[PDB]
Design an enzyme around this catalytic site. Structure first.
Site, PDB file in Angstrom:
ATOM      1  N   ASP A 284       0.834  -1.197   0.000  1.00 48.01           N
ATOM      2  CA  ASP A 284       0.000   0.000   0.000  1.00 48.01           C
ATOM      3  C   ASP A 284       0.865   1.241   0.000  1.00 48.01           C
ATOM      4  O   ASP A 284       1.360   1.658   1.049  1.00 48.01           O
ATOM      5  CB  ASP A 284      -0.880  -0.027   1.252  1.00 48.01           C
TER       6      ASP A 284
ATOM      7  N   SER B 227      -0.898  15.571 -11.982  1.00 48.15           N
ATOM      8  CA  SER B 227      -1.166  15.209 -13.358  1.00 48.15           C
ATOM      9  C   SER B 227      -1.436  16.470 -14.173  1.00 48.15           C
ATOM     10  O   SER B 227      -1.978  17.451 -13.658  1.00 48.15           O
ATOM     11  CB  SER B 227      -2.365  14.262 -13.404  1.00 48.15           C
TER      12      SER B 227
HETATM   13  N1  LIG Z   1      -4.106   3.715   3.030  1.00 56.79           N
HETATM   14  C1  LIG Z   1      -4.409   4.340   1.911  1.00 56.79           C
HETATM   15  N2  LIG Z   1      -4.028   3.835   0.766  1.00 56.79           N
HETATM   16  C2  LIG Z   1      -5.177   5.566   1.975  1.00 56.79           C
HETATM   17  C3  LIG Z   1      -5.905   5.980   3.151  1.00 56.79           C
HETATM   18  C4  LIG Z   1      -6.577   7.185   2.987  1.00 56.79           C
HETATM   19  S1  LIG Z   1      -6.321   7.799   1.407  1.00 56.79           S
HETATM   20  C5  LIG Z   1      -5.331   6.483   0.961  1.00 56.79           C
END
Ligand SMILES: N=C(N)c1ccsc1
Ligand SMILES: N=C(N)c1ccsc1
Length: 330
Positions: free
Chosen positions: A35, A199
Site C-alpha cells: 500500500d 497530473s
Molecule cells: N491507506 C491508503 N491507501 C489511503 C488511506 C486514505 S487515502 C489512501
C-alpha cells in the site's frame, strides 16, 4: 541488493493485490497488500482476537527465533474506506522477493475491523508511503522500503500491476524490459506523507486532451481512480445510462455498455486506461447495473490514482533524496 516479487489480484475484479512476504525465522509467509498510501506493516497474528480471524494466515512471533517485542509500542490505523486495525509491535526479519531487512517493525494486530475479518485473502498490509505516516507510538517506525533503501542498488521500487493478471513489485532496480517507450518522471510532494504529484490533465475516449493540473496520490492500496467531480462527470457523460447513485455509493452504468478509455497526463506524456479497466462488474450478483472504476473524490479531500490508473502503467517510486514518480506505458 534487490528484490522482486509477484503480486496477484485477490479476486476477479482486481479489488486488491497480494504479495507474499517472509517474516521471521523460520520464515512465515503471509500474503500482504502493498500500500503506497500508508506506512504501517501490520499482520494478522496469534494475538488477533480469535473471533476476528476467518481464514487468514497469521504471524506467530513466539515461533520466530528472531522476533523481539518492541516494548511499549502500540499502533492504530484507519483506512480510506473506514476500516481499521490496531495492536502491538515486534521487530523481526522480513524478506520480500529475496530482499531482506532485519529489525523491521512488524505490527501485530490485536483487533481488526469487520471488512478485514471478512476478507480471507489479505493477511495484512505492507505500507510504502513515507515513514512520517507510520502510526507506531511512542516511537515512530520506518517502512520496509525506508529500512531497505541504503542497501538497495538504487533507492527505488516499482509497481507493475496487472489487469486481471499477476504483476510485479521490484525493489532496487528498474526492469527496462517491463515497459515500452520511455519513463516520464514528475515531481513529488512529501508534505502529506504520500507519493503526491500533479497530473497535467485528461482525455475521455478519443476526445481532446484537457490541460489542467490535478493533484493526487499514487496509491496501490486503493482500488479505484478518484478524481474531481468535474472530470468524473465528463467521463460518465460519455456512457449511455450512466448515473451517480447515492444508494449504491457512486457512479453506476449499464452492464451492456462498452466503456471509453480514460487518459491522464504525466508531464507531456499520456497514460491510457482502457475502458475495460473501468468496469467493476455488477453492483450485486445478477444485477445489470455495473459499478464504475472512476469515481468522484469529492468528500475524500484528495484525488487518488489507485489501481485502476496505476495498472495501466509501469510506475517508479523514486526514493532518492528528492523523491519523484515515474510513469511508462507497457
Ligand atoms: N491507506 C491508503 N491507501 C489511503 C488511506 C486514505 S487515502 C489512501
Ligand atoms: N479490508 C479492507 N477494507 C481493506 C483491504 C485493504 S485496505 C482496506
Amino acid at each position: 541488493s534487490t528484490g522482486s516479487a509477484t503480486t496477484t489480484p485477490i479476486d476477479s475484479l482486481d479489488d486488491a493485490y497480494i504479495t507474499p512476504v517472509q517474516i521471521g525465522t523460520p520464515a512465515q509467509t503471509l500474503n500482504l497488500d502493498f500500500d503506497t498510501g500508508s506506512s504501517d506493516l501490520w499482520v494478522f497474528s496469534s494475538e488477533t482476537t480469535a473471533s476476528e480471524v476467518d481464514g487468514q494466515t497469521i504471524y506467530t512471533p513466539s515461533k520466530s527465533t528472531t522476533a523481539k517485542l518492541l516494548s511499549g509500542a502500540t499502533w492504530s490505523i484507519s483506512y480510506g474506506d473506514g476500516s481499521s486495525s490496531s495492536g502491538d509491535v515486534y521487530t523481526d526479519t522480513v524478506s520480500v522477493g529475496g530482499l531482506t531487512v532485519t529489525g523491521q517493525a512488524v505490527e501485530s494486530a490485536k483487533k481488526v475491523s469487520s471488512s478485514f475479518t471478512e476478507d480471507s485473502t489479505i493477511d495484512g498490509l505492507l505500507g510504502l508511503a513515507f515513514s512520517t505516516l507510520n502510526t507506531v507510538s511512542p516511537t515512530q517506525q520506518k517502512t520496509f522500503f525506508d529500512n531497505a533503501k541504503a542497501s538497495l542498488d538504487s533507492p527505488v521500487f516499482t509497481a507493475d500491476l496487472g489487469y486481471h493478471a499477476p504483476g510485479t513489485y521490484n525493489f532496487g532496480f528498474i526492469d527496462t524490459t517491463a515497459y515500452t517507450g520511455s519513463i516520464t518522471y514528475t515531481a513529488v510532494s512529501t508534505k502529506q506523507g504520500f507519493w503526491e504529484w500533479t497530473s497535467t490533465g485528461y482525455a475521455v475516449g478519443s476526445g481532446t486532451f484537457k490541460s489542467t493540473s490535478i493533484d493526487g496520490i499514487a496509491d496501490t492500496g486503493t482500488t479505484l481512480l478518484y478524481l474531481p467531480a468535474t472530470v468524473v462527470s465528463a467521463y460518465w457523460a460519455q456512457v449511455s445510462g450512466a448515473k451517480s447513485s447515492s444508494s449504491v455509493g457512486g457512479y453506476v452504468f449499464p452492464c451492456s455498455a462498452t466503456l471509453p478509455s480514460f487518459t491522464f497526463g504525466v508531464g507531456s506524456a499520456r497514460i491510457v486506461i482502457p475502458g475495460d479497466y473501468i468496469d467493476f462488474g455488477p453492483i450485486s450478483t445478477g444485477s445489470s447495473s455495473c459499478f464504475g472504476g472512476i469515481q468522484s473524490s469529492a468528500g475524500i479531500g484528495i484525488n487518488i490514482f489507485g489501481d485502476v490508473a496505476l495498472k495501466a502503467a509501469f510506475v517508479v517510486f523514486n526514493g532518492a533524496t528528492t523523491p519523484t514518480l515515474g510513469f511508462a506505458s507497457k
